[PDB]
Amino acid sequence: MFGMGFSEILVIALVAILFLGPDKLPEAMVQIAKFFNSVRKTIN
Amino acid sequence: MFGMGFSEILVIALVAILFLGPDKLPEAMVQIAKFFNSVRKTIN
Amino acid sequence: MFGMGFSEILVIALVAILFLGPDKLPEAMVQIAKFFNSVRKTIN
Amino acid sequence: SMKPHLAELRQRLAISVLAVFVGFIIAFTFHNAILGWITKPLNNALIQVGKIVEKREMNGMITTHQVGGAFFVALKVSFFAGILMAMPVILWQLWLFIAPGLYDNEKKMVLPFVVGGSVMFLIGVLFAYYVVTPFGFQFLITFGSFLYTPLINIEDYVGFFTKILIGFGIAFELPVVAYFLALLGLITDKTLKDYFKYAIVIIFLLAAFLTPPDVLTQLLMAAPLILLYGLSILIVHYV
Amino acid sequence: SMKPHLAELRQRLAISVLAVFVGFIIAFTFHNAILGWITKPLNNALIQVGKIVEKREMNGMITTHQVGGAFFVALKVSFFAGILMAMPVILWQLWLFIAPGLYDNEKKMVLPFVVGGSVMFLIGVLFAYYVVTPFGFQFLITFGSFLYTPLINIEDYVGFFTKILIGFGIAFELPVVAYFLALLGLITDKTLKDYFKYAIVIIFLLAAFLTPPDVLTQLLMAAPLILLYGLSILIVHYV
Amino acid sequence: SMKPHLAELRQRLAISVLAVFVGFIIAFTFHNAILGWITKPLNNALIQVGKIVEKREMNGMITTHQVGGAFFVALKVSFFAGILMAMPVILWQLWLFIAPGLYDNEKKMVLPFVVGGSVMFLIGVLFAYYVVTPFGFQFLITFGSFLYTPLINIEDYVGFFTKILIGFGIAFELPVVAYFLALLGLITDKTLKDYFKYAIVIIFLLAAFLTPPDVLTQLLMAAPLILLYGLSILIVHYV
């Protein structure tokens, strides 16, 4: 995916788990889902 | 995406804007959307 | 797609046609579709 | 519905795969000869530019930068030659697959077209090699002759050479495709002049597909395709 | 609605593309000078490490591993220099595109910022070259000097050197944008400290995007970005 | 629900990352020794083929084509060695994560399996190096010895060597997992013979994932996997 290997994705996930953590990771996930839903409803 | 970088995608978009232009670019977009919808309804 | 060229995908399809064949290729396709649908309904 | 079209396709793909494998075996038997044929222009260019450089002053050669390098270059050359030798078998099996679908007129339309296209592909590859590759290789070696030392490795060279030959064959084919569609009658100069707006976008898409993700390679591949399109327009106009 | 925003965008993209083409023409006219400038640190480091190696004992130079190598390196250098030359024209066309959307105060906020950012980018590129590139190149050649022979090829070197300069320019820029946002007032040290958790994830995403699919390159690119973020926090704190 | 499984996972991933970092530090301390170990067979093969070529006539060595070449090769070797040294800590932490989910019998099912698999991986790596790498390297250098000059670069060689070692370790492991599953009883020869249709497709998928986008590399990687599957069938049959 544009010069981004699977291991690099795993490292990004690792950094997200480490630095966001038990809190703010579900919050970030729900924010990303809300942004994606807003994009989908705007492009509809 | 199969040896096709983001900059190459941007160049394809540049060529599309330059050569299709104010007209025939919305027409091409609607034709592509219609083709995608037909493919989706056939594979359904 | 992650160091997987288009020709490699075609080779995987060729191997699938050769070894699965007239039978068990529709079965495998429907099983993959069922797995994808189950994943989609679980992540919903 | 799909049961016979999967069984027959399976058997024909098996025949094609066996043909490719046998071609690979023969090509690996003669891989030294095929590699010598592929590398002959490189050696000639290196010797000629060495003579030029020695004249100016008054070294470079073919290298391997990996083990898998040399062995895999032999395997690559054998694979391409095997695919090429199996191409009659693959094309004949594809024809056997498609034939019950075409009407009797399409058959007579297609077969001589296939022969002519194959002939033009061969002429293009031969032209590439014998005319283009000497002069182009000499020019490219001499371009960096006064700055760098040409330690040309076989691994990238085989791919470069194969791309050159295949591209010149396709470039010789495509005008023939335009001339065929003009003689039979499906396109005119107006059609090619009015569909250039989408033709150029598809050309850039193909250049992106057939090149590394760099933009410069994309433009370097799009330019010959645009020139081929213009030559095609001229051919259809004069028909 | 989108008709004028496509017509004007088309005309401005045409002007920018023509500027890039003219810049590429000029750059290819002077490609020997530009390549000499780019390769001067490599030659200097090679000679210095050769002296060091000969002192230890009591060879390496710039090569080409493809012919398309040297010609394409000239084209690549000319293309980048063309983009750089056209960059004022592209930026001015983008400003004309964006300006009728900004209010009067935003205009004064932006244009001095653009000048300052461009100056900082230039200072970063000059710093990269003149200070960093000699010492870094000498260190890196001497690192493998007692084990391997440095047959450095121009094809990878041009890209590596361009990444070094571009990255150092961007590294000089990012603190200045932090300082500008701290002066005008949109962020504080608390903002930069409280958004580090997401900043590091975005930094690793950027490192993945800007590097080959290897993880080690991703970490090697993330480390300078994290250091730049910390320096930015310090700058905003003292402001 | 996910709160403890994210807090504990965060702490265990932190400990694993710290272990990887400490292993990297130790490995970069001893990177000269590790690189000597890695490059010893290459030097031996080059010397042997030099003797062969000198006998036939009556040169090649290890190179670097980039500065990042030597330095990044040291960093890559240190990173792999660090991951290896951390592997006991990472695996023990994964066990600590997984254990409260397994029943008491599964625990004794798993642990000796892990020890045996690790031993087989080590035996495979040692076998790869000491037996395979000398003969294979000599053969592959001698294959292109009468045509090309072996200017083997360290950057590609480190990856090639690591791929060989890891692949031989995995190849030694997979038969052992087949034998284990046969001894305990979860598969028979019929299961492995009847699931070959899907196994071969998965093998080609894995070969595509683990190889460059070339088809030839995909087949060259699929062939050992098919041979391993057949050997596994034999093992489970004799069990």
Q: Which of F197, F200, F214 sits opposite C24 (nearest CB)?
A: F197
- Tokens 């020794």 appear where? F33
Beta carbons of D118 and D74 less than 8 angstroms apart: no
Distance from CA of F76 to the nearest CA of E (A): 7
Q: Where are the domains of chain B?
A: 6-43
Greatest pairwise CA separation for chain E in angstroms:
77
Is the Cα dihedral E99, E105, E107, E113 positive or negative? negative
For residues F125 and F132, give the distance between their C-alpha atoms in angstroms, rounded to a whole number.
10
Q: Which long-range contacts (CB under 8 A, 24 or more apart) does D232-239 make?
A: D232/D174, D232/D175, D232/D178, D232/D192, D233/D189, D233/D192, D233/D193, D235/D175, D235/D178, D235/D179, D235/D182, D236/D178, D236/D179, D236/D181, D236/D182, D236/D187, D236/D188, D236/D189, D236/D191, D236/D192, D237/D189, D239/D179, D239/D182, D239/D183
Q: Which of D65, D149, D220 sits opposite E64 (nearest CB)?
A: D149
CB count within 10 Å of CB C42 equals 7
- Tokens 């041979």 appear where? F227
Size of interface B-D (CB pairs under 8 A): 47
The amino acid sitting at E90 is I
For residues F63 and D64, give the distance between their C-alpha atoms in angstroms, rounded to a whole number.
11
Report chain A residues whose CB lies below 8 A from the CB of E216: none
For residues E219 and E203, give the distance between their C-alpha atoms in angstroms, rounded to a whole number.
10
Report chain C residues whose CB lies below 8 A from the CB of D13: 14, 17-18
- Tokens 């890196």 appear where? E140
CA distance to B12, E156, E209, per residue, from E24 (Å): 20, 21, 27
Report chain E residues whose CB lies below 8 A from the CB of D144: 64, 67, 69-71, 73, 154
What's the number of CA atoms in the CB half-sphere (13 Å) around residue E162? 17
Chain CA centroid to CA E220, Å: 16
Residue D127: both structure tokens together:
């032209």
Q: Who's near B40: CB < 8 A, 6+ residues apart?
A: none
Residue (of C28, C33, C5, C4) closest to C17 by Cα position: C28
> First and final CA of chain F: distance in angstroms?
43
Beta carbons of E82 and E89 less than 8 angstroms apart: no
Residue (of F50, F69, F35) closest to F150 by Cα position: F50
User: Interhelix angle for E31-57 vs E67-98, to 10°?
Assistant: 130
Q: Is E207 left (phi over 0), alpha (psi -120 to 50) or beta?
A: alpha
Report chain F residues whose CB lies below 8 A from the CB of E143: 67, 70-71, 74
DSSP secondary structure letter of residue C3: S
Q: Who's near E239: CB < 8 A, 6+ residues apart?
A: E179, E182, E183
CA distance to E151, E195, E238, F212, per residue, from E190 (Å): 50, 8, 12, 46
- Do F17 and A14 count as a contact with CB atoms less than 8 A apart? yes
CB count within 10 Å of CB F146 equals 11
The secondary structure of F177-237 as a DSSP string is: HHHHHHHHTS--HHHHHHTHHHHHHHHHHHHHHTS-S-HHHHHHHHHHHHHHHHHHHHHHH
Residue (of E154, E68, E77) closest to D137 by Cα position: E68
3-state SS, chain D, equals CHHHHHHHHHHHHHHHHHHHHHHHHHHHHCHHHHHHHHHHHHHHHHHHHHHHHHHHHCCCEEEECCHHHHHHHHHHHHHHHHHHHHHHHHHHHHHHHHHHHCCHHHHHHHHHHHHHHHHHHHHHHHHHHHHHHHHHHHHHHHHCCCCCEEEEEHHHHHHHHHHHHHHHHHHHHHHHHHHHHHHHCCCCHHHHHHCHHHHHHHHHHHHHHCCCCCHHHHHHHHHHHHHHHHHHHHHHHHC
Q: Tell me, yes or no, if B43 comes closer than 8 A to chain A by beta carbon.
A: no
Size of interface C-F (CB pairs under 8 A): 50
- Tokens 């249709």 appear where? F197
DSSP secondary structure letter of residue B23: S
- Do A18 and F14 count as a contact with CB atoms less than 8 A apart? yes
| DSSP three-state, residue B39 | helix
Q: Who's near F225: CB < 8 A, 6+ residues apart?
A: F203, F206, F207
Q: Which residues of C touch D (CB under 8 A)?
A: 14, 17-18, 21-22, 25-26
Beta carbons of F64 and F70 less than 8 angstroms apart: yes
- Do A17 and F9 count as a contact with CB atoms less than 8 A apart? yes
- Do D17 and C14 count as a contact with CB atoms less than 8 A apart? yes
Q: Tell me, yes or no, if B3 comes closer than 8 A to chain C by beta carbon.
A: yes
Beta carbons of F60 and F150 less than 8 angstroms apart: yes
Report chain A residues whose CB lies below 8 A from the CB of E211: 3, 8
- Tokens 């800007």 appear where? E210
The secondary structure of A16-27 as a DSSP string is: HHHHT-TTTHHH
Residue (of F184, F193, F154, F202) closest to F43 by Cα position: F154
For residues D152 and D141, give the distance between their C-alpha atoms in angstroms, rounded to a whole number.
10
DSSP secondary structure letter of residue F148: S
Q: Which of F141, F149, F216 sits opposite D67 (nearest CB)?
A: F141
For residues D208 and D197, give the distance between their C-alpha atoms in angstroms, rounded to a whole number.
17
DSSP secondary structure letter of residue E213: S
What was the elucidation method?
Answer: cryo-EM
- Do E64 and D153 count as a contact with CB atoms less than 8 A apart? no
Distance from CA of B44 to the nearest CA of C (A): 12
Q: Tell me, yes or no, if A6 comes closer than 8 A to chain C by beta carbon.
A: yes
CB count within 10 Å of CB A1 equals 13
3-state SS, E81-111, equals HHHHHHHHHHHHHHHHHHHHHCCHHHHHHHH
Q: How many residues does chain B have?
A: 44
User: Interhelix angle for E133-143 vs E31-57, to 10°?
Assistant: 50
Best F61, F139, F148, F155 residue to mutate vs chain D (most D CBs within 10 Å): F148
3-state SS, F63-120, equals EECCHHHHHHHHHHHHHHHHHHHHHHHHHHHHHHHHHHHCCHHHHHHHHHHHHHHHHH
For residues D59 and D46, give the distance between their C-alpha atoms in angstroms, rounded to a whole number.
9
Q: Tell me, yes or no, if A21 comes closer than 8 A to chain B by beta carbon.
A: no
For residues D32 and F136, give the distance between their C-alpha atoms in angstroms, rounded to a whole number.
20
CB count within 10 Å of CB F70 equals 22
CA distance to E70, E178, E190, E197, per residue, from E194 (Å): 49, 15, 6, 7
Residue E221: both structure tokens together:
């690119």
Is the Cα dihedral F166, F172, F174, F180 positive or negative? negative
Residue C23's closest chain D neighbor by CA?
Answer: D3
Residue D6's closest chain C neighbor by CA?
Answer: C22
Report chain E residues whose CB lies below 8 A from the CB of A22: none
Q: Tell me, yes or no, if B5 comes closer than 8 A to chain C by beta carbon.
A: no
Residue F66: both structure tokens together:
């980039």
Distance from CA of F45 to the nearest CA of C (A): 31
- Do D154 and F140 count as a contact with CB atoms less than 8 A apart? no
User: Subunits with at least 3 CB pairs below 8 A relative to chain A?
Assistant: B, C, E, F
For residues E235 and E178, give the distance between their C-alpha atoms in angstroms, rounded to a whole number.
8
Report chain D residues whose CB lies below 8 A from the CB of E62: 147-149
Beta carbons of F34 and F27 less than 8 angstroms apart: yes
Residue D234: both structure tokens together:
């001229």
Q: Which long-range contacts (CB under 8 A, 24 or more apart) does F157-163 make?
A: F157/D66, F157/F39, F157/F42, F157/F62, F158/F38, F158/F73, F158/F76, F158/F77, F159/F76, F160/D66, F160/D67, F160/D68, F161/F38, F161/F42, F161/F133, F162/F80
- Tokens 């690591």 appear where? F162
Report chain C residues whose CB lies below 8 A from the CB of D2: 26
For residues E80 and E75, give the distance between their C-alpha atoms in angstroms, rounded to a whole number.
9
For residues E68 and E71, give the distance between their C-alpha atoms in angstroms, rounded to a whole number.
5
Q: Which of E2, E4, E13 sits opposite B18 (nearest CB)?
A: E13
Q: Which residues of B touch D (CB under 8 A)?
A: 2-9, 11-12, 15-16, 19-20, 24, 28
Find residues 61-100 of chain E whose CB sits inside 8 Å of chain D.
61-76, 79
CB count within 10 Å of CB E82 equals 20
Residue B1's closest chain C neighbor by CA?
Answer: C1
Q: Tell me, yes or no, if E140 comes closer than 8 A to chain F by beta carbon.
A: yes
Residue F15's closest chain A neighbor by CA?
Answer: A18
Residue D137's closest chain E neighbor by CA?
Answer: E67
Instruction: Name the burial class of residue A28, with classes exposed (0-12), middle (13-18) and buried (19+) by CB atoms within 10 angstroms of its CB.
Output: middle
Report chain D residues whose CB lies below 8 A from the CB of B2: 209
Residue (of E202, E124, E204, E200) closest to E164 by Cα position: E124
Q: Who's near D29: CB < 8 A, 6+ residues apart?
A: none
For residues F145 and D32, give the distance between their C-alpha atoms in angstroms, rounded to a whole number.
12
| DSSP three-state, residue F150 | strand
Residue B8's closest chain A neighbor by CA?
Answer: A2
3-state SS, E133-190, equals HHHHHHHHHHHCCCCCEECCEHHHHHHHHHHHHHHHHHHHHHHHHHHHHHHHCCCCHH
Q: Which residues of F touch C (CB under 8 A)?
A: 196-198, 200-201, 204-205, 207-215, 218-219
Best F2, F6, F94 residue to mutate vs chain A (most A CBs within 10 Å): F6
Q: Which of F6, F14, F17 sits opposite A25 (nearest CB)?
A: F6
Size of interface C-D (CB pairs under 8 A): 19
Q: Is A23 left (phi over 0), alpha (psi -120 to 50) or beta?
A: beta
Beta carbons of F79 and F24 less than 8 angstroms apart: yes
Beta carbons of F42 and F137 less than 8 angstroms apart: yes
Instruction: Name the burial class of residue F163, with classes exposed (0-12), middle (13-18) and buried (19+) by CB atoms within 10 angstroms of its CB.
Output: middle
